Amino acid sequence: VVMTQTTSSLSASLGDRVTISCSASQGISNYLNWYQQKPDGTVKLLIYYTSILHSGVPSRFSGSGSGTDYSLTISNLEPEDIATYYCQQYSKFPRTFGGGTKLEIKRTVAAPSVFIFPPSDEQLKSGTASVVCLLNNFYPREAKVQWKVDNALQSGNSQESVTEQDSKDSTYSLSSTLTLSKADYEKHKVYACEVTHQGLSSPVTKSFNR
Amino acid sequence: GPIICAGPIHSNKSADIPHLLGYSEKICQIDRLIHVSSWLRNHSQFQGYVGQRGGRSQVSYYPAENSYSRWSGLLSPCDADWLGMLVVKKAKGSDMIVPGPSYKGKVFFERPTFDGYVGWGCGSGKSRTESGELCSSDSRTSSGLLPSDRVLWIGDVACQPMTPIPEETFLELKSFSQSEFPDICKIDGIVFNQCEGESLPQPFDVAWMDVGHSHKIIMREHKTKWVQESSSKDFVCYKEGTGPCSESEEKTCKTSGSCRGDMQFCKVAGCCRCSLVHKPGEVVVSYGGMRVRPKCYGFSRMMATLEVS
Amino acid sequence: EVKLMESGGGLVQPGDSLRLSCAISGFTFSDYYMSWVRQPPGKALEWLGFIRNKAKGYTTEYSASVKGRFTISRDNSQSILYLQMNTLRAEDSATYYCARDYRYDDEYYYAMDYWGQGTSVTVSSASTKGPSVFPLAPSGTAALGCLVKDYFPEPVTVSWNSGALTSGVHTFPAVLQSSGLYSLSSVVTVPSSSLGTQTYICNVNHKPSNTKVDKKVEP
């Protein structure tokens, strides 16, 4: 049996009602449970058998559903409820879990504050050059970073990382790290990072010259 | 005698049977043994219908006494097939025909196998040998429109809607079954225990239930008890002597409470007329700690092989 | 208070074996089935198998994923559940939870009602390597940072100015490179009007290699 949680992430505002939806590759005849994992890693039981609330779970939680379709519903998102929500079935032998649904808080659009860093000398003395682009305190998490060495989109040699949404301002921050050889680093002249985001009217680009 | 429609007195063996959508339309078709007939058409080079005048109530059952068929409202493997709840499989060369039943003259006979349900059919103008292994030509069948004695249903079976169980429960039942029947090695060719040397196929009178997983759960000691639900599937709609209500008429009679019916129907559904089908209700097995509402439940004969120690 | 505590994870090489164990508090251990569940990193909870209770005579069941390599077993005397992982392999690396499940056969209510904290297992062929830290020099407000690069086993802590500097720092999730070692940034926004009045040292330590480095980051 294959479970699908429709949305990987899911944005919401404190206090209002939230619904996470679980869909099953075949009818699981109500044998469905709901777990909640918080970032520390901890896991707790919330609902078992579609709608039965596990001991000590608050009443704002409820789940329901049938056949192949099941849903978890917090009636007042409260800050503690910000966590990843996993569903899991037990009609067929390999107990299988969903893919989870992490809960993000909605805030006003925020534009990134883009910085770039050129590879440091210690690093170059050692055979690798790393260019690093930073996107600071942006919202929503979706954003696209483009690396352009002498105006050529370089793809296959960058890696990105996003923080978890901040407790303080509900923003994200992203770092893209362009990993090169010192050979291929010295082979070009203009290095640029391109950032397209909802709060940017036009693609901001910060760049440096070797 | 029947549940809706009295035994059918069919016009011609070459006429085809429609697929109806109503519940009571099908319950009638089962009363007129239309379902076994279609099976034979769909599968065995058969021309026509079966159950002439006698109908479903007049079929032959292997154990000569046969309690569940005394209640018109219990479903047989074929009746449960006709409502999509299960499949009565076409016999394979390998499928073992139990000895005991009187196969002489039979055009269709069926038994539960360990991993399903198997029925046997015969072609035009044919009927089964006395062994069951061959249809020799029987010119008493050449009319194509045969009585219900040409239909054989092996075993004392009941089939009901099943609330399905987590496979975890099934593995745990499966295990207990092996623990009550430690000596059996293979049933109807499906591995029941794992054995080194296995005996010759022997005949096997057994209780079992279909819990809807890989195979049935054979039980030595257990407890069965029946409860009546008054459900929407427990009531049939008809115009007396005119047959069953159409599908639309039926959907309406049960949901808008505006038709007629017996007290038991009106008590729960309010008040074409629909009444309660005669059965003890639905059976609930109690086996090795657990309670299960099974798909089918019965006492059949299957082919088990035993351990050589 | 039902408690479960996993223990015994680490970095082992493919083919290696490794035994995890789960310690029980607050409830009659022999009563409950127990399951082992693993969560590959950047993945979802996988369920692996379980061991029934004394009533159903300590039988076990295993997901296809690991049948014949893993082995669940309990030690009623010590109140410990064990996961025995033989012929380990790169795909096995994940964090491993044990969890007690609640069973109501009469209604078919089967659910994993109390969980451990997780113990992390990494199965890899690479030997521990400590990180290289290179600075991320500056130019309203300014941003500056460290680049922790090329380190195996994952846990790397990064703090700034020995814990004084906390507001406005971001330490990013490590990323596994095609090299098979990890790399990460930790960066901070500072008033640009102090860039040079104030020393910023990011102190990174990486426990598995006993590597500890403080780097000064200057303009």
Q: Please state the separation of Cα C41 from the chain's center in Å.
A: 8
User: Does the beta carbon of B163 lie under 8 angstroms from any beta carbon of chain A?
Assistant: yes
DSSP-derived letter for residue C195 is B
B193 burial via Cβ count (<10 Å: 0-12, 13-18, 19+): middle
Q: Can the peptide bond before residue C219 be classed as cis, meaning omega within 30 degrees of 0?
A: no
The SS3 call for residue C12 is: strand
Please answer whether residues B137 and B124 qualify as being in contact, where contact means their C-beta atoms are separated by less than 8 angstroms: no
Identity of residue C119: T
> Which among A41, A45, A113 has the least Cβ separation from residue C111?
A45
The two tokens of residue B41 are: 């058409």
| Residue pairs spanning B and C at CB distance below 8 A | 14
Chain A: nearest CA to C6, how far in angstroms? 12
Q: Are residues A140 and A70 in the same domain?
A: no
DSSP-derived letter for residue C45 is P
DSSP-derived letter for residue B307 is B
Closest Cα to residue B153, out of B60, B231, B14, B244?
B60
Residues of C with CB under 8 A from a CB of B: 56, 59, 61, 105-106, 108, 110
In sequence order, the 6+-apart residues with CB closer than 8 A to the CB of B228 are B234, B280, B281, B282
Dihedral of CA B184/B189/B194/B198: which sign? positive
Tokens 């994870």 belong to residue: C9
The CATH number linked to A183 is 2.60.40.10
Pairing label, strands A190-196, A204-209: antiparallel
Chain B: nearest CA to C82, how far in angstroms? 22
The two tokens of residue B123 are: 């072609």
Identity of residue C33: Y
Q: Please state the separation of Cα A53 from the chain's center in Å.
A: 28
Give me the sheet containing C3-7, strands edge to edge. C3-7, C18-25, C80-85, C70-75
Contact C59 B175 (CB under 8 A): yes
* Alpha-carbon separation of residue B31 from A75, B55, B265 (angstroms): 52, 6, 21
Q: What residue spans of B124-271 are helical by DSSP H?
A: 167-180, 247-255, 263-269
Closest Cα to residue C75, out of C118, C17, C14, C34?
C34
The SS3 call for residue C104 is: strand
The two tokens of residue B20 are: 């109806």
Q: How many whole angstroms separate alpha carbon C61 and alpha carbon C49?
A: 5
Chain A: nearest CA to C41, how far in angstroms? 11
The two tokens of residue B196 are: 């080194």
Please answer whether residues A188 and A210 qualify as being in contact, where contact means their C-beta atoms are separated by less than 8 angstroms: yes
Q: How many whole angstroms separate alpha carbon B170 and alpha carbon B192?
A: 14
Q: Are residues A169 and A98 in the same domain?
A: no
Closest Cα to residue B193, out of B168, B169, B166, B215?
B215
CB environment C9-25: b (16+ within 10 A), e (fewer): bebbeeeeebebbbbbe
Neighbours of chain B (3+ CB pairs under 8 A): A, C
Please answer whether residues A20 and A72 qualify as being in contact, where contact means their C-beta atoms are separated by less than 8 angstroms: yes
C-alpha neighbours within 13 Å on the C-beta side of residue A165: 21
Torsion of CA B209, B213, B214, B217, to 10 degrees: -20
Chain A residues touching residue C61 (CB < 8 angstroms): 93
Q: How many whole angstroms separate alpha carbon C4 and alpha carbon B300?
A: 49
Last residue of one domain, picked from the residues A105, A121, A153 = A105
Q: Are residues A94 and A11 in the same domain?
A: yes
User: Does the beta carbon of B167 lie under 8 angstroms from any beta carbon of chain A?
Assistant: yes
Q: How many whole angstroms separate alpha carbon A84 and alpha carbon A166?
A: 16
The SS3 call for residue C99 is: strand
User: Does the beta carbon of A21 lie under 8 angstroms from any beta carbon of chain C?
Assistant: no
Helical (H) or strand (E) element with C9: none
Please answer whether residues B163 and B291 qualify as being in contact, where contact means their C-beta atoms are separated by less than 8 angstroms: no
Pick the residue from chain B with its C-alpha nearest to A67: B164
Tokens 């520390």 belong to residue: A40
Neighbours of chain C (3+ CB pairs under 8 A): A, B
The two tokens of residue A130 are: 């790393």
Pick the residue from chain B with its C-alpha nearest to A27: B164
Chain A residues touching residue C169 (CB < 8 angstroms): none
Closest Cα to residue C149, out of C174, C126, C178?
C174
Contact A120 C172 (CB under 8 A): no
The two tokens of residue B292 are: 């299960």
Q: How many whole angstroms separate alpha carbon B302 and alpha carbon B113?
A: 7
DSSP count for chain B of H helices, then E strands: 7, 22
Closest Cα to residue A166, out of A139, A130, A198, A195?
A139
Q: What phi and psi, each to the nearest 5 degrees, are found at residue C66? A: -135, 15
Helical (H) or strand (E) element with B136: strand B135-137
Chain B residues touching residue A29 (CB < 8 angstroms): 163-164
Please answer whether residues C99 and C112 qualify as being in contact, where contact means their C-beta atoms are separated by less than 8 angstroms: yes
Please answer whether residues C181 and C197 qualify as being in contact, where contact means their C-beta atoms are separated by less than 8 angstroms: no
**Optimal mutation site among B162, B165, B168, interface A, most CBs of chain A within 10 A:** B168
Q: Are residues A101 and A121 in the same domain?
A: no
Helical (H) or strand (E) element with B297: strand B296-306
Pick the residue from chain C with its C-alpha nearest to A34: C111
The two tokens of residue C64 are: 């296809």
Please answer whether residues B127 and B139 qualify as being in contact, where contact means their C-beta atoms are separated by less than 8 angstroms: no
Dihedral of CA A116/A118/A122/A126: which sign? positive
User: Does the beta carbon of A163 lie under 8 angstroms from any beta carbon of chain C?
Assistant: yes
User: Does the beta carbon of B214 lie under 8 angstroms from any beta carbon of chain A?
Assistant: no
Q: Please state the separation of Cα C126 from the chain's center in Å.
A: 17
Which of A 13-32 lie inside 8 A of B, CB atoms?
A: 29, 31
Q: How many whole angstroms separate alpha carbon C99 and alpha carbon A168?
A: 34
Q: Are residues A120 and A191 in the same domain?
A: yes
Closest Cα to residue A129, out of A84, A184, A87, A172?
A184
Q: How many whole angstroms separate alpha carbon C123 and alpha carbon B263?
A: 70
Neighbours of chain A (3+ CB pairs under 8 A): B, C
Give the CA radius of gyration of chain A.
22
Last residue of one domain, picked from the residues A55, A73, A105 = A105
Name A44's bridge partners. Answer: A36
The two tokens of residue C37 are: 């569940």
User: Does the beta carbon of B291 lie under 8 angstroms from any beta carbon of chain C?
Assistant: yes
Q: How many whole angstroms separate alpha carbon B159 and alpha carbon A103?
A: 47
Identity of residue A58: P
In sequence order, the 6+-apart residues with CB closer than 8 A to the CB of B175 are C59
Question: Which domains, and CATH codes, for chain C?
Answer: 3-123 (2.60.40.10), 132-217 (2.60.40.10)
Name A175's bridge partners. Answer: A134, A161
Chain A: nearest CA to B190, how far in angstroms? 20
Q: How many whole angstroms separate alpha carbon B22 and alpha carbon B243?
A: 12
Look at phi and psi of residue C14 and say left if phi exceeds 0, alpha if psi is from -120 to 50, else beta: beta
| Residue pairs spanning A and B at CB distance below 8 A | 12
Q: How many whole angstroms separate alpha carbon C85 and alpha carbon C88?
A: 6
3-state secondary structure chain A: CCEEECCCEEEECCCCCEEEEEEECCCCCCCEEEEEECCCCCEEEEEECCCEECCCCCCCEEEEEECCEEEEEECCCCHHHCCEEEEEECCCCCCEECCCCEEEECCCCECCEEEEECCCHHHHCCCEEEEEEEEEEEECCCCEEEEEECCEECCCCEEEEECCCCCCCCCEEEEEEEEEEHHHHHCCCEEEEEEECCCCCCCEEEEEEC
Contact B164 A29 (CB under 8 A): yes
* Alpha-carbon separation of residue A94 from A91, B125, C37, C61 (angstroms): 9, 51, 11, 10
Contact C47 A31 (CB under 8 A): no
Tokens 């040079």 belong to residue: C196
Tokens 């058409």 belong to residue: B41
What is the separation, in whole angstroms, between the first and last Cα of chain C?
A: 54
Helix, strand and coil content of chain B, in percent to the nearest 5, comes to 25, 30, 45
The SS3 call for residue C72 is: strand
Which of B 149-208 lie inside 8 A of C, CB atoms?
A: 165-166, 168-169, 171-172, 175
Chain B residues touching residue C110 (CB < 8 angstroms): 166, 168
The two tokens of residue B305 are: 């092989």
Q: How many whole angstroms separate alpha carbon A196 and alpha carbon B4?
A: 72
Q: Are residues A101 and A120 in the same domain?
A: no
Chain C residues touching residue A33 (CB < 8 angstroms): 111-112
Q: How many whole angstroms separate alpha carbon B107 and alpha carbon B267?
A: 43
The two tokens of residue A191 are: 């290095």
Chain C residues touching residue B211 (CB < 8 angstroms): none
Q: How many whole angstroms separate alpha carbon A139 and alpha carbon A144?
A: 12
Q: How many whole angstroms separate alpha carbon B162 and alpha carbon B173?
A: 16
Chain C residues touching residue A49 (CB < 8 angstroms): 107-109, 111
Q: What phi and psi, each to the nearest 5 degrees, are found at residue C132? A: -95, 130
Please answer whether residues B61 and B280 qualify as being in contact, where contact means their C-beta atoms are separated by less than 8 angstroms: no
Helical (H) or strand (E) element with B82: helix B77-82
Which of B 270-289 lie inside 8 A of C, CB atoms?
A: 289
Give Dmax over CA atoms of chain B in angstroms: 68
Q: Cβ–Cβ contacts within 10 Å for residue B160, how many?
A: 22
Pairing label, strands C132-136, C141-151: antiparallel
Pick the residue from chain B with its C-alpha nearest to A31: B166
Q: How many whole angstroms separate alpha carbon A1 and alpha carbon A23?
A: 11
Tokens 């029941």 belong to residue: B192
Q: Are residues A132 and A205 in the same domain?
A: yes
Chain B: nearest CA to C120, how far in angstroms? 28
> Which among C112, C134, C143 has the least Cβ separation from residue A45?
C112
Closest Cα to residue A143, out of A97, A61, A203?
A203
> Which among B166, B171, B289 has the least Cβ separation from residue C108?
B166
Q: Are residues A100 and A136 in the same domain?
A: no
Q: Are residues A163 and A132 in the same domain?
A: yes
Helical (H) or strand (E) element with B17: none
Q: Are residues A70 and A125 in the same domain?
A: no
Last residue of one domain, picked from the residues A105, A126, A157 = A105
Tokens 């069919």 belong to residue: B10
Domain that holds residue A87: 3-105
Q: How many whole angstroms separate alpha carbon B40 and alpha carbon B56?
A: 15
Q: How many whole angstroms separate alpha carbon B253 and alpha carbon B243?
A: 15
Q: Are residues A141 and A122 in the same domain?
A: yes
Domain count, chain A: 2
The two tokens of residue B73 are: 């409202």
Q: Please state the separation of Cα A206 from the chain's center in Å.
A: 25
Tokens 């249903």 belong to residue: B153
> Which among B163, B164, B167 has the least Cβ separation from residue A93?
B167
Please answer whether residues B125 and B48 qualify as being in contact, where contact means their C-beta atoms are separated by less than 8 angstroms: no
Please answer whether residues C28 and C3 qualify as being in contact, where contact means their C-beta atoms are separated by less than 8 angstroms: no
Q: Are residues A152 and A63 in the same domain?
A: no
The two tokens of residue A36 are: 């909640």
* Alpha-carbon separation of residue B102 from B65, B109, B123, B141 (angstroms): 14, 10, 18, 17
Q: How many whole angstroms separate alpha carbon C113 and alpha carbon A35?
A: 9
The SS3 call for residue C200 is: strand
Q: How many whole angstroms separate alpha carbon C111 and alpha carbon A30?
A: 12
